[PDB]
Amino acid sequence: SREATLNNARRKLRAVSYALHIPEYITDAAFQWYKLALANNFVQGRRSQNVIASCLYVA
Amino acid sequence: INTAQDKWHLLPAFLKVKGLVKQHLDSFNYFVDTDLKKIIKANQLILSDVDPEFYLKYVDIRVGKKSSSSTKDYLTPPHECRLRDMTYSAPIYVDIEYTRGRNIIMHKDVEIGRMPIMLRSNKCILYDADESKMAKLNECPLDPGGYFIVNGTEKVILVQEQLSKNRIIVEADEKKGIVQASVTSSTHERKSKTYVITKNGKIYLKHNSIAEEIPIAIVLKACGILSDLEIMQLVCGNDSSYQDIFAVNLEESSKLDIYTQQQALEYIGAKVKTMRRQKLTILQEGIEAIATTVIAHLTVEALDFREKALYIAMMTRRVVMAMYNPKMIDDRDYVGNKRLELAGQLISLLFEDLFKKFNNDFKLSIDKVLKKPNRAMEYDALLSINVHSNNITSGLNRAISTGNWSLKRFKMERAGVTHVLSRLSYISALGMMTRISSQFEKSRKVSGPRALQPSQFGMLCTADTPEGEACGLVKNLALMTHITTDDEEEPIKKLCYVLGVEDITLIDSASLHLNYGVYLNGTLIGSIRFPTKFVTQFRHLRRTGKVSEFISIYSNSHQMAVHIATDGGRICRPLIIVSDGQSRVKDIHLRKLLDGELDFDDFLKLGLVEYLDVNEENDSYIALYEKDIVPSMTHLEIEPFTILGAVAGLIPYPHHNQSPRNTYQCAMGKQAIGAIAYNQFKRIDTLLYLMTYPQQPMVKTKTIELIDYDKLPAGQNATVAVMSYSGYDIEDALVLNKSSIDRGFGRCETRRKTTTVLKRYAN
Amino acid sequence: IEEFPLKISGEEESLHVFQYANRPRLVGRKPAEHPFISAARYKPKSHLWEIDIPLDEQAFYNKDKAESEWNGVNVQTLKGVGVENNGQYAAFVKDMQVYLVPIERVAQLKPFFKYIDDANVTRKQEDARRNPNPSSQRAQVVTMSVKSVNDPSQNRLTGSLLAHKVADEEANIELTWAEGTFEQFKDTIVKEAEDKT
Amino acid sequence: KEAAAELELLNADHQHILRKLKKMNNKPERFMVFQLPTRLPKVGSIRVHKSGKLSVKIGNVVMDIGKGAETTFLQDVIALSIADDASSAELLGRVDGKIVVTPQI
Amino acid sequence: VKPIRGFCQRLKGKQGRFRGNLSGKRVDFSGRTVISPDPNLSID
Amino acid sequence: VEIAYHKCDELITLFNKGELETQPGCNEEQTLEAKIGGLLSKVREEVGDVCINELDNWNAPLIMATCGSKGSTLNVSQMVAVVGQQIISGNRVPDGFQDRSLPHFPKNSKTPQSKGFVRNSFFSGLSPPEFLFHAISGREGLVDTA
Amino acid sequence: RQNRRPELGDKFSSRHGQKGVCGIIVKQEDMPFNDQGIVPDIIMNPHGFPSRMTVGKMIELISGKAGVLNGTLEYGTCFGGSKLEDMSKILVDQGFNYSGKDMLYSGITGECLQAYIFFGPIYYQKLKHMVLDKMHARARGPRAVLTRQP
Amino acid sequence: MIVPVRCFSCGKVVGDKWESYLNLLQEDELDEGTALSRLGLKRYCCRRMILTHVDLIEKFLRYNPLE
Amino acid sequence: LGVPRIKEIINASKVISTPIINAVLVNDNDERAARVVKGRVEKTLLSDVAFYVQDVYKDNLSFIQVRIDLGTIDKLQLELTIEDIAVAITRASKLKIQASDVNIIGKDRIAINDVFYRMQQLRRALPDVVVKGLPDISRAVINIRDDGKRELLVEGYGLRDVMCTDGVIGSRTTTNHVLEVFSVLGIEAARYSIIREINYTMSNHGMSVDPRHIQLLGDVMT
Amino acid sequence: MLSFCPSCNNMLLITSGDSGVYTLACRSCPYEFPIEGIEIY
Ligand SMILES: [Zn+2]
Ligand SMILES: [Zn+2]
């Protein structure tokens, strides 16, 4: 359900995190930030590259 | 000066040229020089389903080179990397193409992940440094190497020992299990061999992907040459003492009435399952041909199915000799039936699967990108390699920091590969290396793979074994040793065709069982006569001729064959060649040696020493001393004390003891406190016991002079009165001396570290 | 003391040997066989070399010798495959010399079955004759099944059984020799007139 | 006694191959199957030394004498020579004795 | 480790609630130190 | 030891040129091994007997042997007199090779100092095949105990 | 790091093949001296030699005595090294006994020893079995969450 | 490391016994034993330290990165 | 004699590795009598008795000749009653093909019985049958007791036909079994065997204990 | 019998003689003989 979407988001955030050369704690910080943002229903239907890049950019 | 009685200065020259610990360094250097560049050519084409134009193509791969600048411009220093809790690594560099433009192909040269490199190798800092770079690098110039720091600690890849691969090993049981088993490898298929016997004469080929059984008289008549007379004549012998026992299971080709047209394939493979897809790919010949070729033998045999026929025909010639001859068995404890894998082969088998698990995910990313009406992928192919670059590094560090190597093509789980490096003493750091671990680790069997065999004179140490449950399984390895690597078996076989052999295209007769037939590690080439002249010619060619350099030949008279072993993994030891009158000292060779020229790796060119430990020496005769020669010999032994290992090499007069006390003392000699390294006061270790006032051994064994143990001792010297004093001297109960122990006798330094990394959270 | 010349002069190359795996060497220790009179037919570029040999009349007109019932057997056959070797040569012994004809081509043979080799497939096809299991799918048979090239999923046959596949595509009928004496004997000596060491 | 076995077996093989080479091969249809290894650097010039030491090789290149191959069953004859337009064959016939050249170093 | 533990591996043997947690249990008030000889004590 | 090796040399060469017979056991090469083991255990017994007969007063191995301390008179014979016939699997050492045991021994080894008979004491220094044989016996006894 | 003084209970083993744990510590002079007056450091068991069957340590004391006497670090490798025949000649040429023995004077009474006692240097290594690293205790302390046992 | 000030078993001081030994081995060379005999060594348990004891502190003081 | 012996007695295993049947005779090795007991009850090596196995093909459903060796069995005379060989063959199946019509003619030509497959089954099954003795007995070795009496041991499992055999007395049979001894002599003889054989296999290596512990070990499983 | 049959090179088997004389033959091979007594060793 929603956990599969957060798993896909965690894999994409893992990809952008290990590609952008950031440490491992800020990956979990961006993950909980994306979880809070999706709890606030901030965006839908994007290609998700811009979304994960923007969340990792603010984190 | 010496005339002929020295016989000793070959071992320091050997230790200076090659060295003691080379079971990891030489194998890893051969890996990063040949195999890391070779196995990438087998996986270079990454063609996709969508948009059938895109490809990469690997043309070059190398470790830590960066061929514009220097090697890394840091190549993070090893003792600093041990304290920083970093892995000691140097990255990968590759050269690849693209399909960037409509008419443009880029040749961008990128990197893919990091890779650990063991110390003292080619691609390291600590190669060829002597108290200046050693002093600036802040580490001891006496460590054995063969290890690499991963995640703060350092791990040592143990030398794994398994059985042989392309051989036919004999087994036995209580008159029912006369199974003539084997294994095989075409680098992706082992799965079985299971040549078991159920009824007398009935030695049906078993398999796991088959229902019941397949007879020999239909295998040798279907996928072998068919005559129904050579099965009495070619495979069993001429005299009736063997054929009268082999008379059963020769009428089975007449009982079921098979008589090969295509039903001799249909009956042997109507019982095999899972035919690879839903096409039903047999087409009354196909799965039978591929089951003959690839899943049961190491030869592809594209046109002539007769070499595998003669291989099975000589395999079944031993099980008849396991029945008529009252139970002679080549047991699976002899060293000639034993090949061991090194650190390079294990790290290659790791890398060849982790590269596949990288490439499949990268192809998945390519297929994820190419799925939109946007412009074609120019630069995201140039990019998006440092997004799965942390799959080779993280996996390559995890599999060496844990020790459980999951592979998706061989289907095994290997546990307990490495070990944390114990630094109780310098003897511990030398003897935990050069260790032969095994596969029979936890099994309570007496007098099996626990009792040592007489084929260990110079091969392995006969006194180095820790007492307990692992007694006879983790024994170490001797000093004068070398391990063969395999170049190629094809020029060797062609040179055998040059030296006067016939092939297996014209040799079917009753004269197959004349004088000894030549082999190449599990493949017969020809039943040649005049065996001593062939061995003499190759004896002259291994010293004078062009390319042999690692080949053991030996004539076995009981099974009436002669073999040639060329696979990699067997052990060696140097020995002096004699010719019927004298040795090869001759008053000038060792004189030129200790004058300051003509070192090792030149005495093989002239013909003095030649390192070997296979059953070549079983077809030989080795002398002990100078005053023991007989004019019928082959070789002699250089030093007699090369049988004891390095951990058994500090015992003063070991031959004046019984063997259990030597075994106990060599087991507990890598346990005492000492003077581990020169950076003793500049390192941080998790468990480090230190000696305060170390002193030399008063008596020196002639092996600890060479391993610099006199420089770095592991104890203390003391006079001692052997008497029964005060009743405190009952059963290994010593009594010390106040005001002698008060002056610094046996003072200890126990060092424990406590690292608490402070981390910032994701909050 | 005594010198023998030998010179390489081979430019014919089609002289494959045939290891007859039925006849012992000098049966009864008396040369009385002379069995080489036979016929043949070949196959190009697939290395089969089947040869049929004529019959002697010991006892046949027996029913079990053509099939289980009948094909009318009249000839024995023999066939065998084999890859060519490298290094062997023949020799001529022309009254004081040696000529060293190249052989270089070997294919061993075994006795191949003569009319059982179609009998088992013929009985299964006759049992598969007039069967109702091939229903109306035979009418709408289409050859539209063209497939793409093997993108990284599983591959084709691709050379592992090509020597096993090519055994029915073509076959040549090569006649007997029965009179050939001049051609591979005198032209070999004429080649020595232009060799001249 | 492997040196002795070498001595008497090579003497018997040399006497047999000298006796067989000079009988029944003037003009019958009688052949001989050689082998000669690869990498040859021919005039032939095959000399014969006396006292049983048959130095049977070429004396223009390095002398690597040796002979005495296996006598085998299952008669293997050349027996023909063909071509490919519609071609026919030849009488060759009757291979009897096997001989190789074992090089010495 | 991929067997799961249920109510049979807790009763199986040598680490379960029969053969190392019930019959032979870790008792209190003990101590473990190496031994040196001494003749001058009585045998009690 | 010289007359024992001479007697064993005739006892093996009367099978090399002739034949050997035995009533109770098997046909050959087991009663041969039993007779070699007996005629070499008699050597150990006699040389240990003359060793303890010759041995000194206030001799501390003899003091422990006459009192029952560490080591019997067999241990004192292994000290001074001779060591012989190590015991593995109730017989001598088997073939570690094809047809023999070590490269320092000739083929078809069926003599003493070819199939596992040490002849040197611990004082005189052991031979390297004898040291290997004693290592065989020591590791076999230790793993049997375990 | 702590500088552990080697206490009583600590393992001390010879390099030649005999183990050992100390029994008591002797003050200075209750151990028997000689004419030069050198008090030995450790005293080993004579019973540890026969049943463990070690005679090379008995050669090791002589080789160590001649090595510390004549100056040269002496041999003693496998199957060769410095023999005993010249070794006894060196020991009797300096003025010591030909067998490593010596007459000693008893500590608690001052008179001679009735039997001779031989003494010389042995390389003594200390093991990783300090009694502080092996002492154990238990009280009414922590218990498990699963069986309420320690 | 550093030679102890007094030997273990006996009590004779071992100061001015090491540098006066290496100074006597480099300059005014003696074989091995007349060095100790002229330096003043009598009891042979006072002679198992100057003859023994590889010098480790000269190899330990090498490791100072510009201290 | 070691710890597998005391391991195998105490659990009362149904099978056992190399037991002995110490049978006692009446007469000594005088000239024939003890060799008769040495030859009767063990095994008939019929591969030595036949000297070959031959048939001849003249009539339909041909017969397979067996030749006796009277001169060979004139050293170990047990069953020179050659109809007894025929009745041991008519011991019915023994090889899953009945050899019943084996009617012998003079000069020892036994006429035993597709066709060739059942012929070769009898060809490779005939040198396996026995004519006298239990098939569960390997061989026997005769020993010399110190008084002069001869005590032969038997490697076997029966203890009924070696006790039924005339020539030996059925007084004492010191065996190694603990379950077959129960099956042929009841409860108390088996428990005396289990308190005697433990004491025998343990006193041979010293370590002698009080045999009341042996009796208490024997009572608590019998 | 462990036959040696020339001109076909296969093992002979002595089956039933097809309702009549007890003959011996091979499987689809012309080499045969009538019985004259088997050559059993
Ligand atoms: Zn002192
Ligand atoms: Zn036939």
Query: Which of D40, D72, D78 to probe by mutation at the B interface, max B CB count within 10 Å?
Result: D72
Question: Which chains does H contact via 3+ CB–CB distances below 8 A?
Answer: B, G
Concatenated DSSP letters for F38-103?
A: HHHHHHHHHHHHHHHHHPPTT-HHHHHHTTT-SS-HHHHIIIII------BTTBS---SSSSSS-T
Distance CA F17, CA B508 (A): 39
Taking CB atoms within 8 Å and a gap of at least 24, the contacts of C183-191 are C183/D81, C183/D90, C184/C12, C184/D81, C184/D90, C184/D92, C185/C92, C188/C9, C188/C92, C188/C99, C188/C101, C189/C94, C191/C9, C191/C11
3-state SS string for B195-221:
ECCCECCECCECCCCCCCCECHHHHHH
Q: Is J31 annotated as a binding residue?
A: no
Task: Give chain D's contact residues with B (Cβ, < 8 Å).
Answer: 2-3, 5-6, 9-10, 35, 37-39, 66, 68-74, 76, 100-105
C124: contact with B, CB 8 A cutoff: no
Distance CA F45, CA F42 (A): 5
**Least distant ligand from the CA of C116:** 2
Instruction: Please state, in angstroms and as integers, the Cα–Cα distance from residue B51 to each residue in B151, C150, C153, following that order.
Output: 42, 14, 16
Give me the residue label for tokens 């002193």.
B695
Return the ∠ at Cα C135 (arms to C130 and C137), rounded to 5°: 130
3-state SS string for B385-435:
CCCCCCCHHHHHHHHHHCCECCCCCCCCCCECCCCECCCCCHHHHHHCCCE
Looking at the structure of chain D, the number of domains it has is 1
- At I146, which amino acid appears? D
Instruction: Find the helix packing angle between A2-20 and A49-58, rounded to 10°.
Output: 60
Strands (DSSP E) found in G9-135: 12-14, 21-26, 101-102, 117-126
Which residues are B674's β-sheet partners? B690
Residues of chain H with Cβ-Cβ distance to G121 below 8 Å are: 45, 48
Distance CA B553, CA C103 (A): 31
Q: How far, in Å, from the CA of F17 to the mean position of ligand 2? A: 51
Alpha helix locations (H) across B506-658?
A: 531-544, 589-595, 603-606
Range C53-65 burial, b when 16+ CB lie within 10 A, else e: beeeeeebeeebb
Q: Answer yes or no: do J32 and C111 touch at CB < 8 A.
A: no
- In chain G, after which residues is the C-to-N distance over 2.5 Å, breaking the chain? none
Stated length of chain A: 59
DSSP code for B654 = G
Residues of chain B with Cβ-Cβ distance to E38 below 8 Å are: 728
| Structural domain harbouring D24 | 1-105
Distance CA C3, CA D44 (A): 9
Strands (DSSP E) found in I43-167: 53-55, 64-66, 104-105, 109-110, 140-144, 150-154
C-alpha neighbours within 13 Å on the C-beta side of residue A20: 18
Distance CA I180, CA I177 (A): 6
**Least distant ligand from the CA of B228:** 2
DSSP code for C176 = -
Q: Answer yes or no: do B390 and A28 touch at CB < 8 A.
A: no
Instruction: Please state, in angstroms and as integers, the Cα–Cα distance from residue B287 to each residue in B206, B290, B439, G89, I141, following that order.
Output: 17, 5, 34, 84, 58
DSSP code for H2 = P
Q: Is J25 annotated as a binding residue?
A: no
Distance between J19 CA and the closest CA of chain B, angstroms: 21
Q: How far, in Å, from the CA of J32 to the mean position of ligand 2? A: 8
Q: Answer yes or no: do B462 and F96 touch at CB < 8 A.
A: no
Resolution in A: 4.0
Distance CA B273, CA B291 (A): 11
Q: Is the dihedral of CA I165, I169, I170, I175 positive or negative?
A: negative
- Token readout for B202 is 């009935």
Instruction: Find the helix packing angle between I3-10 and I180-203, rounded to 10°.
Output: 150
Q: Answer yes or no: do J25 and C62 touch at CB < 8 A.
A: yes
Contacts of C70 (CB under 8 A, 6+ apart): C63
Q: Is H47 annotated as a binding residue?
A: no
Question: How crowded is residue I28: how many other Cβ atoms within 10 Å of its Cβ?
Answer: 12
Distance CA C1, CA B714 (A): 76
**Least distant ligand from the CA of C64:** 2
Quick one: closest CA in E to B729, which residue?
A: E37
Among B513, B550, B522, B518, CA closest to B534: B518
Distance between H1 CA and the closest CA of chain B, angstroms: 6
Question: In chain H, what are the domains?
Answer: 1-67 (1.10.10.60)
F56: contact with G, CB 8 A cutoff: no
DSSP code for D87 = -
Distance between I67 CA and the closest CA of chain J, angstroms: 13
Distance CA B284, CA B282 (A): 5
**Do chains E and H touch, with touching meaning 3 or more CB–CB pairs less than 8 Å apart?**
no
- Token readout for B488 is 């190629």
Q: How far, in Å, from the CA of J25 to the mean position of ligand 2? A: 7
Residues of chain C with Cβ-Cβ distance to B261 below 8 Å are: 113, 116-117, 120-121
Pairing of strands C39-41, C50-53: antiparallel
Distance CA B36, CA B42 (A): 11
Question: How crowded is residue B341: how many other Cβ atoms within 10 Å of its Cβ?
Answer: 17
Quick one: closest CA in I to B245, which residue?
A: I124
Distance between C133 CA and the closest CA of chain B, angstroms: 18
Quick one: closest CA in J to B240, which residue?
A: J41
Compare CB distances from H48 to G37, G39, G121 and report the shortest one's residue: G121
B533: contact with D, CB 8 A cutoff: yes
Residues of chain E with Cβ-Cβ distance to G134 below 8 Å are: 32-34
Q: Is H39 annotated as a binding residue?
A: no
Q: Answer yes or no: do F79 and G55 touch at CB < 8 A.
A: yes
> Are residues B526 and B568 in contact, defined by beta-carbon separation less than 8 angstroms?
no
- Token readout for G140 is 């009414």
Distance CA B654, CA B648 (A): 8
Give me the residue label for tokens 């390699």.
B385
F122: contact with G, CB 8 A cutoff: yes
Distance CA B228, CA J2 (A): 10
**Do chains D and C touch, with touching meaning 3 or more CB–CB pairs less than 8 Å apart?**
yes
- Token readout for A54 is 């923007």
Question: Which chains does D contact via 3+ CB–CB distances below 8 A?
Answer: B, C
Reduced to 3 states, what is the DSSP secondary structure of residue D31? coil
| Structural domain harbouring J13 | 1-41
Contacts of B210 (CB under 8 A, 6+ apart): B271, B272, B273
Distance CA B236, CA G66 (A): 69
C154: contact with B, CB 8 A cutoff: yes
Compare CB distances from G4 to B733, B740, B750 and report the shortest one's residue: B750
Strands (DSSP E) found in chain E: none
Distance between C25 CA and the closest CA of chain D, angstroms: 6
Question: How crowded is residue B321: how many other Cβ atoms within 10 Å of its Cβ?
Answer: 19
C-alpha neighbours within 13 Å on the C-beta side of residue B82: 20
Task: Give chain G's contact residues with F (Cβ, < 8 Å).
Answer: 46-51, 53, 55-56, 78-79, 115
Distance CA B276, CA B656 (A): 66
Q: Is the dihedral of CA B664, B665, B669, B672 positive or negative?
A: positive
Compare CB distances from H54 to B680, B698, B711 and report the shortest one's residue: B711
Q: How far, in Å, from the CA of J35 to the mean position of ligand 2? A: 16
Among H45, H53, H48, CA closest to H1: H53
Return the ∠ at Cα C160 (arms to C158 and C161), rounded to 5°: 100
Quick one: closest CA in G to H43, which residue?
A: G36
Distance between C22 CA and the closest CA of chain J, angstroms: 6
- Token readout for D84 is 């490919």
Quick one: closest CA in D to C173, which residue?
A: D86
The DSSP element (H or E) to which C18 belongs, if any, is strand C18-19
Pairing of strands B635-636, B688-691: unpaired
Q: Answer yes or no: do B733 and E38 touch at CB < 8 A.
A: no
B650: contact with G, CB 8 A cutoff: yes
Distance between F125 CA and the closest CA of chain G, angstroms: 7
Q: Answer yes or no: do F122 and G46 touch at CB < 8 A.
A: no
Contacts of F121 (CB under 8 A, 6+ apart): F78, F79, F80, F81, F82, F83
Torsion of CA B366, B369, B372, B377, to 10 degrees: -80
> Are residues B246 and B201 in contact, defined by beta-carbon separation less than 8 angstroms?
yes
Contacts of A18 (CB under 8 A, 6+ apart): B387, B389, B390
Q: How far, in Å, from the CA of I22 to the mean position of ligand 2? A: 58
- At G37, which amino acid appears? G
Looking at the structure of chain J, the number of domains it has is 1
Instruction: Please state, in angstroms and as integers, the Cα–Cα distance from residue B209 to each residue in A21, B205, B213, following that order.
Output: 48, 12, 11
- At B274, which amino acid appears? T
Question: Which chains does E contact via 3+ CB–CB distances below 8 A?
Answer: B, G
Distance CA B703, CA B12 (A): 10
C-alpha neighbours within 13 Å on the C-beta side of residue C22: 25
- Token readout for B51 is 């948009």
Distance between C75 CA and the closest CA of chain D, angstroms: 21
Among B652, B677, B674, CA closest to B662: B652
**Least distant ligand from the CA of J33:** 2
Q: Answer yes or no: do I57 and J35 touch at CB < 8 A.
A: yes
Whole-number CA gyration radius for chain G? 21
Distance CA C119, CA C112 (A): 14
